[PDB]
Design a protein around this ligand. Structure first.
Ligand SMILES: [K+]
Ligand SMILES: [K+]
Ligand SMILES: [K+]
Ligand SMILES: [K+]
Ligand SMILES: [K+]
Ligand SMILES: [K+]
Ligand SMILES: [K+]
Ligand SMILES: [K+]
Ligand SMILES: [K+]
Ligand SMILES: [Mg+2]
Ligand SMILES: [Mg+2]
Ligand SMILES: [Mg+2]
Ligand SMILES: [Mg+2]
Ligand SMILES: [Mg+2]
Ligand SMILES: [Mg+2]
Ligand SMILES: [Mg+2]
Ligand SMILES: [Mg+2]
Ligand SMILES: [Mg+2]
Ligand SMILES: [Mg+2]
Ligand SMILES: [Mg+2]
Ligand SMILES: [Mg+2]
Ligand SMILES: [Mg+2]
Ligand SMILES: [Mg+2]
Ligand SMILES: [Mg+2]
Ligand SMILES: [Mg+2]
Ligand SMILES: [Mg+2]
Ligand SMILES: [Mg+2]
Ligand SMILES: [Mg+2]
Ligand SMILES: [Mg+2]
Ligand SMILES: [Mg+2]
Ligand SMILES: [Mg+2]
Ligand SMILES: [Mg+2]
Ligand SMILES: [Mg+2]
Ligand SMILES: [Mg+2]
Ligand SMILES: [Mg+2]
Ligand SMILES: [Mg+2]
Ligand SMILES: [Mg+2]
Ligand SMILES: [Mg+2]
Ligand SMILES: [Mg+2]
Ligand SMILES: [Zn+2]
Lengths: 91, 384, 205, 50
RNA sequence: UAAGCAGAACUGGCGAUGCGGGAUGAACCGGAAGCCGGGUUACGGUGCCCAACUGCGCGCUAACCUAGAACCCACAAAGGGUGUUGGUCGA
RNA sequence: GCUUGUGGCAGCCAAGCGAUAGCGACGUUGCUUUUUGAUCCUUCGAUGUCGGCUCUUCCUAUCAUUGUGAAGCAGAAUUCACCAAGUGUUGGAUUGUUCACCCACCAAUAGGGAACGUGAGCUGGGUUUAGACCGUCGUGAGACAGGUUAGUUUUACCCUACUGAUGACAGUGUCGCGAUAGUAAUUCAACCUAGUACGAGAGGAACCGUUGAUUCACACAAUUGGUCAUCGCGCUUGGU
RNA sequence: CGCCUCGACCCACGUUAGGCCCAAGGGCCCGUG
């Protein structure tokens, strides 16, 4: 809503760096699981795209990103900020 | 019924039993984890507690009220002349734990360390290691020594050096019997450790090869004995009212009717002091090396020519002539007590750990009274 | 259940993939009857019910302790061989001199230490998991339970066991070459004395 | 927040069912609770909206 | 209200009684008795403690609550379950 | 000890309130043994009867602190619920109290058990001997479960338990291993975040980082403080 | 580590919804004085 989430890809694909989530000073680091790649997408405003061969490993890496961006101690029906899966498919 | 008010229990159950230590020299109960990537090095040292003094330094610590301001701090002096390596010990793994594989000793052992193997040195023939030394003379004997070393390189997973102190350098100790301990080598491969420890035979390893300035170390020793003691001093319980019949320095209730026994958790009277203790995170403020300017108690701000020893000597200790460590705070045991110094078991990634100490002043006034002079030269110039 | 009756010097039992309480029951009868039993590889004994049920059973046991002096209370051993030793002791009248002697005839080990790496290790058919447990039901290994509750020599046991299996694999290759040589020898020796061995033909297997 | 992204965030924070016994958050098509402590109760209610 | 409470009817029992079983126990189950040898049973049992099958046969159960496991007896209820397995009556 | 009426705690239904956020009448099922009764099984050749002080353990039906789910949860606050007994739960006025009730601090000032824990541990204010007042009652001697004041608190050297201390166990010594047992850290604040998120406004968080403090534990004596028969030095009374 | 007053015959790992098997229910041994 207010604080723009800043994401940074650490390696070529392996890492993502989330900062300014809800305007916080903590740095959230998620390492992609083995064989999974991530890219700050173009042609879309605020999308990250995860790629891989194993369905469980790609889906679990997206689950890690979403769960590290949970709003604490606030009404989450109002504070809807987060990172959510928008489309899952097989290319 | 439940107790009317809550207070926490007196004393820790984690230091039980409060008995006399079974050893005099403090023992390393766990060496640091070996990192085979680092170069070979020793992990511990032996030293002797000389005395205490206080220093003045300017503190660099942003966010503190002491930032850019001077502080006074009490320091303990530990005299640490170099150790002599006299052997190697190997350990192999086993489902029951580590086991000594074999040991190799040097050809020359001083009589100070050989006294450690005798209850009455002067009544004996002093035969210890007299026939072992003959392996270094023949050629079959040298073959055994090399074969033992090669067995170390092939089968051992832990290699430790056997080292002893040069206890006669400290005349005030009045002791000729050296202190002997095993020190682990914590670098390189097993062949690297064996080669490193073998090249040190009959050689002096200084304290600077083991520790450096501004490092947090652990000190192991036996505390000061105090003998039989009551519950008030041994455990810190509160006294009873003045009106108490049969005395007031006891625990009133030592247990309920059930269980119909006294529990191990109730404070009782017994031995106080002379316990083994491992104290960690003591910072090194200075390394005084014999034959160097760092041995003197002069700083960059104080150019007065003085020695580390206070006026009149260290009380009950003597004069510090060998290498020494200045350490922030107090240290286990009384003066003259042998203390074991060990490298930290954990990573010291902290501000206090990483702080750089710069001394402004070292007090060298007499500790045997309300001393007011820093040197004997100043005292004589004052009185004419 | 009675004893084996096999009357040997000592039987070495390979404990891998046996049910813990069924193995301890048979061993206890053997010891009480006078047999010496050596149990190796106690780290791979199986207990029905998975890790979770077995782990909390130990945690309840770990709760038990003499309130006034714990070093007097129950002793909770963490190693797989001492756990199996205590399970067997529970099935023996160990406070009598007969049960004291019976329990002194039992040796239990993790892995296969010498000299039993070069001896014959038997199995107990009515304690094997493959004959005792349905294929879908949960179970855990003794070493896994022991590792979860404080045992710290699982790695050295595993490293030693890999070294032992390498040596046994080489001894197995050598034994196969000697077996092929043996079959050629009995083939050539079959014709050289063809007439004499006519009575062995109907019982040749 | 754009309304389309609002609908995405409500798929995880809002469109849920609540157990009336153990307060567990459930998928919107749930009929029974997933929890052993409430006995897998069918007494469910929708998650209240702002 | 109840009580290992207080009071009556018929019979048995303990008291006055060991012995086998119910881990243990006045009364429960079996059974009553001189000192013994051999055979067989009662109640209760046959994985070990412990003598006797890890016996032959069909299902049910999976307990992430300490699943459950011997009359008296050493407790459990109303109410629930899209756990699973049998049935009944219907679209 | 049995019982659980009464005391305390927890459920089922759902008429209503605002059906089930939170509650919940009329009914109905339980649990518990820190209430009080009911009983009279044990103890009358005696198990020291209130309360507090001290000290240790234990429970959970959780008050705070950790991690969460729900709200009629915008924020702040609060309420309901879950896993959880690891760590805490205080200083005082009146009262012999237990119970109570106020003052104050605090993150919070939760509830309980252990022979209503704990008198060869203390204390002895209360109960409850003998002295003595008062009121009521009695002809009286006397009574009162009404008030008041004064009223001896014995023994451990035994066994065990517990705390420490030596010690044999097939030479003697040094250096080691480590089964097993014990165990410990804890809570709060300031600054930055930020007058920011949120909110019409009034109000108003938090993570990371930094700096301190509380409670506890283990040491130590450089300095400060305390301690004197250093009988160390000095002064000084009376005597000699 | 130092210093010395009653034939008791037999070594695979691993898996059982798999590696001819379908138990050592085998094999070896003058097994013969
Ligand atoms: K009490
Ligand atoms: K102290
Ligand atoms: K006191
Ligand atoms: K059913
Ligand atoms: K009741
Ligand atoms: K009595
Ligand atoms: K008086
Ligand atoms: K431990
Ligand atoms: K020896
Ligand atoms: Mg809020
Ligand atoms: Mg309390
Ligand atoms: Mg250790
Ligand atoms: Mg007194
Ligand atoms: Mg001094
Ligand atoms: Mg039998
Ligand atoms: Mg332990
Ligand atoms: Mg009679
Ligand atoms: Mg009688
Ligand atoms: Mg007979
Ligand atoms: Mg069967
Ligand atoms: Mg019974
Ligand atoms: Mg039902
Ligand atoms: Mg009631
Ligand atoms: Mg009602
Ligand atoms: Mg009596
Ligand atoms: Mg008594
Ligand atoms: Mg008495
Ligand atoms: Mg609870
Ligand atoms: Mg607690
Ligand atoms: Mg009570
Ligand atoms: Mg009492
Ligand atoms: Mg008394
Ligand atoms: Mg009292
Ligand atoms: Mg008493
Ligand atoms: Mg009185
Ligand atoms: Mg009176
Ligand atoms: Mg009158
Ligand atoms: Mg009075
Ligand atoms: Mg705004
Ligand atoms: Zn539920």
């Amino acid at each position: 809503a207010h604080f723009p989430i800043n994401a940074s890809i650490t390696a070529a694909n392996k890492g993502i760096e989330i900062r300014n989530f809800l305007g916080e000073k903590k740095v959230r680091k998620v390492d992609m699981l083995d064989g999974v790649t991530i890219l700050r997408s173009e042609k879309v405003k605020d999308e990250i795209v995860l790629d891989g061969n194993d369905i469980e490993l790609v889906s679990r890496s997206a689950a890690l990103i979403n769960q590290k961006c949970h709003v604490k101690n606030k009404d989450i029906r109002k504070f809807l900020d987060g990172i959510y899966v928008s489309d899952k498919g097989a290319i | 019924s439940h107790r009317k008010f809550e207070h926490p229990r007196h004393g820790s159950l984690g230091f039980l039993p409060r008995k006399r230590c079974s050893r005099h020299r403090g023992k390393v109960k766990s060496f640091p984890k070996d990192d085979q990537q680092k170069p070979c090095h020793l992990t511990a040292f032996l030293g002797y507690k000389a005395g205490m003094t206080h220093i003045v330094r300017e503190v660099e610590k942003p966010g503190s009220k002491l930032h850019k301001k001077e502080t006074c701090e009490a320091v303990t002096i530990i005299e640490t002349p170099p150790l002599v390596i006299v052997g190697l010990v190997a350990y192999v793994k086993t489902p029951r734990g580590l086991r000594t594989l074999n040991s190799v000793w040097a050809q020359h052992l001083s009589e100070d360390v050989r006294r450690r193997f005798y209850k009455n040195w002067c009544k004996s023939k002093k035969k210890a290691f007299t026939k072992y030394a003959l392996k270094y003379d023949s050629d079959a004997g040298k073959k055994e020594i090399q074969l033992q070393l090669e067995k170390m390189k092939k089968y051992a997973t832990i290699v430790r050096v056997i080292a002893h102190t040069q206890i006669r350098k400290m005349k005030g100790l009045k002791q000729k019997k050296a202190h002997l301990m095993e020190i682990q080598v914590n670098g390189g491969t097993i062949a690297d450790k064996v080669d490193y420890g073998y090249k040190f035979f009959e050689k002096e390893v200084p304290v600077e090869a083991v520790f450096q300035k501004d490092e947090m170390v652990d000190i192991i020793g036996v505390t000061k004995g105090k003998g039989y003691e009551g519950v008030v001093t041994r455990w810190g319980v509160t006294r009873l009212p003045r009106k108490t019949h049969r005395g007031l320095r006891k625990v009133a209730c030592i247990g309920a009717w059930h269980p119909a026994r006294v529990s191990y958790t109730v404070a009782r009277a017994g031995q106080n002091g002379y316990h083994h203790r491992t104290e960690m995170n003591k910072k090194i403020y200075k390394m005084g090396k014999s034959g160097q300017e760092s041995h003197e108690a002069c700083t960059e701000f104080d150019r007065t020519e003085k020695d580390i020893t206070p006026m009149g000597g260290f009380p009950h200790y003597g004069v510090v002539k060998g290498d020494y460590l200045m350490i922030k705070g107090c240290c286990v045991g009384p003066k003259k007590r042998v203390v074991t110094l060990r490298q930290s078991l954990l990573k010291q990634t902290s501000r206090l750990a990483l702080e750089e100490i710069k001394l402004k002043f070292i007090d060298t006034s007499s500790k045997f009274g309300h001393g007011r002079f820093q040197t004997t030269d100043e005292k004589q110039k004052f009185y004419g | 259940v009675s004893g084996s009756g096999v009357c040997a010097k000592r039987v070495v039992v390979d404990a891998r993939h046996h049910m813990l309480g069924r193995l301890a029951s048979i061993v206890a009868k053997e010891l009480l009857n006078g047999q010496r039993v050596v149990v190796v590889r106690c780290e791979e004994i199986c207990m029905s019910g998975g890790l979770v049920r077995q782990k909390m059973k130990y945690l309840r046991f770990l709760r038990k302790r003499m309130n006034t002096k714990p070093s007097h209370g129950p002793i909770h051993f963490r190693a797989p061989a001492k756990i199996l030793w205590r399970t067997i002791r529970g099935m023996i009248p160990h406070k009598t001199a007969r049960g004291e002697a019976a329990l002194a005839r039992l040796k239990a080990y993790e892995g296969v230490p010498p000299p039993y790496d070069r001896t014959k290790r038997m199995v107990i058919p009515d304690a094997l998991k493959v004959l005792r447990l349905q294929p879908g039901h949960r179970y855990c290994l003794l070493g896994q339970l022991s590792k979860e509750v404080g045992w710290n020599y699982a790695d050295t046991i595993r490293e030693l066991e890999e070294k032992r299996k390498e040596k046994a694999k080489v001894s197995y290759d050598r034994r196969k070459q000697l077996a092929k040589l043996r079959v050629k020898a009995e083939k050539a020796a079959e014709e050289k004395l063809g007439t004499q061995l006519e009575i062995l033909a109907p019982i040749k297997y | 927040i754009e309304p389309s992204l609002q609908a995405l965030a409500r798929k995880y924070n809002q469109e849920k069912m609540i157990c009336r016994k153990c307060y567990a958050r459930l998928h919107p098509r749930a009929v029974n609770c997933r929890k052993k402590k409430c006995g897998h109760s069918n007494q469910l209610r929708p998650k209240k909206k702002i």
